[PDB]
Ligand binder design. Structure first.
Ligand code: CL
Ligand code: CL
Ligand code: CL
Ligand code: K
Ligand code: MG
Ligand code: MG
Ligand code: MG
Ligand code: MG
Ligand code: MG
Ligand code: MG
Ligand code: MG
Ligand code: MG
Ligand code: MG
Ligand code: MG
Ligand code: MG
Ligand code: MG
Ligand code: MG
Ligand code: MG
Ligand code: MG
Ligand code: MG
Ligand code: MG
Ligand code: MG
Ligand code: MG
Ligand code: MG
Ligand code: MG
Ligand code: MG
Ligand code: MG
Ligand code: MG
Ligand code: MG
Ligand code: MG
Ligand code: MG
Ligand code: MG
Ligand code: MG
Ligand code: MG
Ligand code: MG
Ligand code: MG
Ligand code: MG
Ligand code: MG
Ligand code: MG
Ligand code: MG
Ligand code: MG
Ligand code: MG
Ligand code: MG
Ligand code: MG
Ligand code: MG
Ligand code: MG
Ligand code: MG
Ligand code: MG
Ligand code: NA
Ligand code: NA
Ligand code: NA
Ligand code: NA
Ligand code: NA
Ligand code: NA
Ligand code: NA
Ligand code: NA
Ligand code: NA
Ligand code: NA
Ligand code: NA
Ligand code: NA
Ligand code: NA
Ligand code: NA
Ligand code: NA
Ligand code: NA
Ligand code: NA
Ligand code: NA
Ligand code: NA
Ligand code: NA
Ligand code: NA
Ligand code: NA
Lengths: 237, 56, 73
RNA sequence: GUGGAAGUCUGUUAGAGUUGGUGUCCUACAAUACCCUCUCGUGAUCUAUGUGUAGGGGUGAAAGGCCCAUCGAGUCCGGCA
RNA sequence: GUCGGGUGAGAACCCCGACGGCCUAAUGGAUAAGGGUUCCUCAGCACUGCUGAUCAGCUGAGGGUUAGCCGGUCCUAAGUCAUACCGCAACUCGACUAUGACGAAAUGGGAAACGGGUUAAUAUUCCCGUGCCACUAUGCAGUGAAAGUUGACGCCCUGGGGUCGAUCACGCUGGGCAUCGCCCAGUCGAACCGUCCAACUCCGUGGAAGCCGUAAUGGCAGGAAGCGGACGAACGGCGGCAUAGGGAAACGUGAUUCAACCUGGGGCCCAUGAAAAGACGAGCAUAGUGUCCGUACCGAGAACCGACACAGGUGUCCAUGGCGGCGAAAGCCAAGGCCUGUCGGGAGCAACCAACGUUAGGGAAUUCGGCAAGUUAGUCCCGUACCUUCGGAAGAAGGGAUGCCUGCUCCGGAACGGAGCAGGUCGCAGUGACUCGGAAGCUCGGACUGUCUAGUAACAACAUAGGUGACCGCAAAUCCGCAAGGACUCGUACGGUCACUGAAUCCUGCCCAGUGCAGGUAUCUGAACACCUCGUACAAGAGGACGAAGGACCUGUCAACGGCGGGGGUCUUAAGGUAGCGUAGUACCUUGCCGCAUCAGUAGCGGCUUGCAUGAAUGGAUUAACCAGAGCUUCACUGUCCCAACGUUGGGCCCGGUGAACUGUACAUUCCAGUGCGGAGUCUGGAGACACCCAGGGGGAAGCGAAGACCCUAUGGAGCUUUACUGCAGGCUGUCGCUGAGGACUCUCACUCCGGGAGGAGGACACCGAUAGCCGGGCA
RNA sequence: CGAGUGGCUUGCUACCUCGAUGUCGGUUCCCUCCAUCCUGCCCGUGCAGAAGCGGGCAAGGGUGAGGUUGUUCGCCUAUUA
RNA sequence: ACGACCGUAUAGUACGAGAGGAACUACGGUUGGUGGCCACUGGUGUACCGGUUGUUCGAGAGAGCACGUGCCGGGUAGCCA
């Protein structure tokens, strides 16, 4: 047949790429030698086109102007600090170690110095739980218990823009507008509504998948569709 | 809209033009590559064996 | 509210658009001062027409159940 | 009362589309045209130019649609008598 | 188009005049692309031109495009290339990363030009006048100088400022008309230099506890109004420009509404609305310099694309000319353009045809079906059902009004704005043309706007929000690449990938036996390397031991593929159809039976319903709104019909000119019968038949058109499928190499990742190379 | 039970055409057949009459409008010689 | 180039217990078909005459355009049913 949609994707053509040239900033934690004396004043609050969440503009003591992953409750004028000796307040970044347990954190680093990887979407937050001299246990927004190096930096507070998922799109047009700001081909045509040549579920005189939907992990691209390596399906039991 | 006559009217774009190298009107001004001599793509002159019968 | 939606979309969809938009448009207490002049500027962005405090909050509420938890700890 | 929202309504505004007449045409004005009728017309809108994606590959709100009158695998030449 | 006339050997169509018309977002003006000399002049008619030609976009010869201040040029956009690096057997191939360059002529950004005159043809380019910018040099000023501002920005609503235009009042100049006193045109004057400043913001004063303010929101003791001040707009006003220019002349003044242009206020976003060069910041004189490329013409029913002088296709600006009216609508008319959507002459002009008007009585009887046509119609007042998601339904339906003339009232600053009143009065008719919905009900489907088969399908199909399941913590899941590498991703579970269902509302039963996916697994099975035995002076080889994923086996899972019967009062094979719906877009029997409705209803609707073979995200039921979707009924309407007629325009017919094509074995005036490979103008027998020509509607030539699409056949082809055959990618897994120190473990030095670095994490694993076993229509 | 006629149905066959003889139903317009539905002339009767039933000659003329259905067919309504 | 039907007189008669109920013949009309014709009725009648809306020719008068009559009203001849 013909390569399915998922395969056309990888090629990275225009249709599948994210509008990078329209993106604001690669939100990452600042780099500090040590000391912590690094602090700055929030100069403005902006809209991040890549995340549909607000982002804060900050002007640092040493003159550097940069955008930062804004947690909820950060306004113009506020003073944020980043370093080992940073005060424990919302909007301040410091290695998990210096952070007191039981405090909601966002924009957590995977490996210390990576500038933040986990918990960065609208309204989410990681939960710092256990400390040590070797491991800092954080509970990510997916509920998973992640064992991190206490040296990994992180920002205090939940990510701004919480509750975005609460309101429905209502109409196709609204989706259209949001979709245009991401690396996604939209709308979505069902496999079952295509020709056999185009997708493994295509064909037939009526719309129904050929074989069962649960495919194996070892299935090749072009064939891995439907419910991937599903451990179970449905809602019963 | 017909793919024939009605779709011919929008054809006012310039692509292939007189080539600086070989002189043929095959220099695609948008690709900046000559379809006849290979100018713009190859230092060597575009030339294939299939441009003639195999035993010739 | 969802009156602009006419007879389209259905109950739930436009019922929740109204509720969310109703609370979104309410007078909100300014964190800077304490005045009821906080309005939405965009997605997650709020500002007081009184003191000009431009800050971050929820997408449709200047404060979310999660942000309120932060303070406590 | 004010306000003036809306994939909101009427609309041959511009513009876009193409339901019926199975009308006219059917060695045509035209290798997809003419007329009347009809649909949309602030939006997932329409459009010019520039630019990207290439042949078992693109592109596809999916009709096996479209990729220069060429598509259930374009076109040219070669394999080839 | 017509009548005159001009030129000419020749004139319906070349030119002048008159009369008559056509085009009004275009048939007018300016342009992009594209064309490429088509532009102008002279000379021509062999070619081209749907006829003719003295004409021409044709033929021939000449001529024609003038720039510091219009474009290009410069900048950067999506993105492109070149070099370097790396890959590759290799390259004219290939992703990344560096660097450089490229990338905008209407329509992104951007130093600067206006007015008049001139030519057969150019013109912000030449000429006259006036102006402006940049650089450089000289001189004076200045040491400030880079922080900042600008360039520079979305969608919707809206105020204020305000020019052109249009209109009104009055005056002046010129014209028109001739029962009046009306009607038309003009009444000009730039760039630039100077000056004015409303809005916004801010400062001083002031001191509001209820005031201030708006079209609206709104503002205030954190200091409202008022008062004074700073900063500060137009392509705008004002003065110069200008006893410049232009006009035969006068060479006006006020007003309203105000495109342009200027400046504010509000609202929206699961959408956030370029960048860079440059400019400002940062004075003035005088002088010099400002090169290079484009510049004609068309820009379309003859200059472009479509083989054509093609009824097609083709972007931008003029959206403010008048009446009209809600209007950038109709209809009519200016300015401007045209009679070239380029063959004519003749016949009350027949038949027949294309468009179309009107038809008495009847009124859908026509037909698959009201197909076609018609009805209705603008505006105001009254009034408006079922149902409903309370939005809607709804212009429901139905009823009334509607002109002109006289004189008025109200709203408003006013309009040449709007709303009314009284009286008079004409017609068959007052939205008098034009413009301008027919209405109501039942059922089916899809919720809705949207999408689609360019060229027979616009739909119930696709999409959608909504619902649901699945995978993944990011050195991820998914996907692309042979590799170097890459998309998702300036992204991080409120994410994004992969699928199913398809708004809302009420719901979504039972089944894990098979198949699929996933987890587990004592035991069984399970490859190669290494190891052991036999064998061979070695080797091939035979066997053994160990045993990964995988399988067996066990468990989980159906909003996973799917299943939900037969029999009797269990059996196959797990369960045995629950809510619902039901003769269905699913019901064979079938026009099922009953009812509604009609004179009569295989239709439609309702009820029943044992359902050949309904049924729950293969989603079931249901549903307001919506619909060029399928079916039915009613009112209204009508040439659809009874049943046809008359008329209108273009053809048709005759004449001048131009001038194809399809088709043609031959013969051919046929007809009735027969015969024949059973469907004969041509054979046989008879009949009929004087030749030629005009018009006609198409009976025959199994008419013309197409080596039949249907069917079969060929050890034909292709696309597609799968538990067909065979293989190939890919994934998983063991082993070997990289690979190191001390059946489970520690370490660090390779190697990998994180970190700017220091250093951190991991670590002999992973990556990569090689091989083996499993899965493997993803592909051949 | 027996003997036939027709060539409207259906079946059978594979003669004719696959370098194509355009489908069903309908419509329009022309000719025909008789195995006669009506009309004319007759015979019989379980022929009083009236109305019928059966038969004979006979193809001159006529044999119409509608409701469901694409239907042919058929069912149904009112008219009708 | 004519086919067929209804009605009246026959006749409430013949026949018949009654109920019911004919015919020959002569008449009048209807229907279908056919040929022709236009005094009459009706249609058309972009001949013509009038009314009137919009706009343009200054008003008036008188006109053009509004699809080949702007629309409305009446309509001669002819052609027609
Ligand atoms: Cl989303
Ligand atoms: Cl130019
Ligand atoms: Cl305002
Ligand atoms: K055949
Ligand atoms: Mg990042
Ligand atoms: Mg996109
Ligand atoms: Mg879909
Ligand atoms: Mg399909
Ligand atoms: Mg497939
Ligand atoms: Mg389905
Ligand atoms: Mg399905
Ligand atoms: Mg094509
Ligand atoms: Mg709309
Ligand atoms: Mg509309
Ligand atoms: Mg494009
Ligand atoms: Mg198909
Ligand atoms: Mg010329
Ligand atoms: Mg000449
Ligand atoms: Mg450039
Ligand atoms: Mg420009
Ligand atoms: Mg010129
Ligand atoms: Mg010019
Ligand atoms: Mg022409
Ligand atoms: Mg009539
Ligand atoms: Mg009927
Ligand atoms: Mg009928
Ligand atoms: Mg119709
Ligand atoms: Mg009317
Ligand atoms: Mg007043
Ligand atoms: Mg039905
Ligand atoms: Mg729909
Ligand atoms: Mg089509
Ligand atoms: Mg449609
Ligand atoms: Mg269509
Ligand atoms: Mg659908
Ligand atoms: Mg969904
Ligand atoms: Mg979803
Ligand atoms: Mg029924
Ligand atoms: Mg279920
Ligand atoms: Mg053949
Ligand atoms: Mg076939
Ligand atoms: Mg094959
Ligand atoms: Mg790295
Ligand atoms: Mg295959
Ligand atoms: Mg034939
Ligand atoms: Mg007989
Ligand atoms: Mg006969
Ligand atoms: Mg006229
Ligand atoms: Na299928
Ligand atoms: Na209100
Ligand atoms: Na059409
Ligand atoms: Na191909
Ligand atoms: Na060949
Ligand atoms: Na000025
Ligand atoms: Na007007
Ligand atoms: Na001519
Ligand atoms: Na719409
Ligand atoms: Na099962
Ligand atoms: Na199973
Ligand atoms: Na089922
Ligand atoms: Na639609
Ligand atoms: Na008619
Ligand atoms: Na014929
Ligand atoms: Na095929
Ligand atoms: Na026989
Ligand atoms: Na037969
Ligand atoms: Na043949
Ligand atoms: Na037929
Ligand atoms: Na007869
Ligand atoms: Na019938």
């Amino acid at each position: 047949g013909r390569r399915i949609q998922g395969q056309r994707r990888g090629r990275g053509t225009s249709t599948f790429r994210a509008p990078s040239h329209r993106y604001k900033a690669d939100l990452e934690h600042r780099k500090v030698e040590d000391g912590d004396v690094i602090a700055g004043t929030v100069v403005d609050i902006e809209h991040d086109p890549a995340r549909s969440a607000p982002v804060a503009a900050v002007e640092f003591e040493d003159g550097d102007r940069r955008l930062i992953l804004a947690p909820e409750g950060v306004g113009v004028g506020d003073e944020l600090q980043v370093g080992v000796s940073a005060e424990i307040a919302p909007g301040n970044t410091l290695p998990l170690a210096e952070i007191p347990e039981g405090v909601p954190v966002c924009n957590v680093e995977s490996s210390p110095g990576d500038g933040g990887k986990f918990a960065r979407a609208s309204g989410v937050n990681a939960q710092l739980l256990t400390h040590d001299r070797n491991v800092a246990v954080v509970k990510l927004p997916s509920g998973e218990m992640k064992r991190l190096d206490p040296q990994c930096r992180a920002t205090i507070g939940v990510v701004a823009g919480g509750g975005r998922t609460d309101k429905p799109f209502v109409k196709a047009g609204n989706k259209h507008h949001k979709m245009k700001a991401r690396g996604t081909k939209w709308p979505n045509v069902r496999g079952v509504a295509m020709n056999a040549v185009d997708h493994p579920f295509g064909g037939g005189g009526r719309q129904h998948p050929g074989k069962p939907k649960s495919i194996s992990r070892n299935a090749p691209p072009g064939r891995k569709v439907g419910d991937i390596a599903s451990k179970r399906t449905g809602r019963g039991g | 809209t017909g793919a024939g006559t009605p779709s011919q009217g929008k054809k006012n774009t310039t692509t292939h033009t007189k080539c600086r190298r070989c002189g043929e009107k095959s220099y695609h001004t948008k690709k900046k590559v000559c379809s006849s001599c290979g100018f713009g793509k190859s230092a060597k002159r575009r030339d294939y064996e299939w441009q003639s019968k195999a035993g010739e | 509210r969802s009156g602009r939606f006419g007879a389209r979309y259905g109950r739930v969809s436009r019922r929740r658009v109204a509720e969310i938009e109703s609370e979104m448009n309410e007078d909100h207490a300014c964190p800077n001062c304490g005045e009821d002049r906080v309005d939405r500027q965009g997605t997650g962005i709020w500002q007081c027409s009184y003191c000009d405090y431009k800050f971050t909050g929820g997408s449709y509420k200047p404060e979310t159940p999660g942000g309120k938890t932060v303070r406590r700890s």
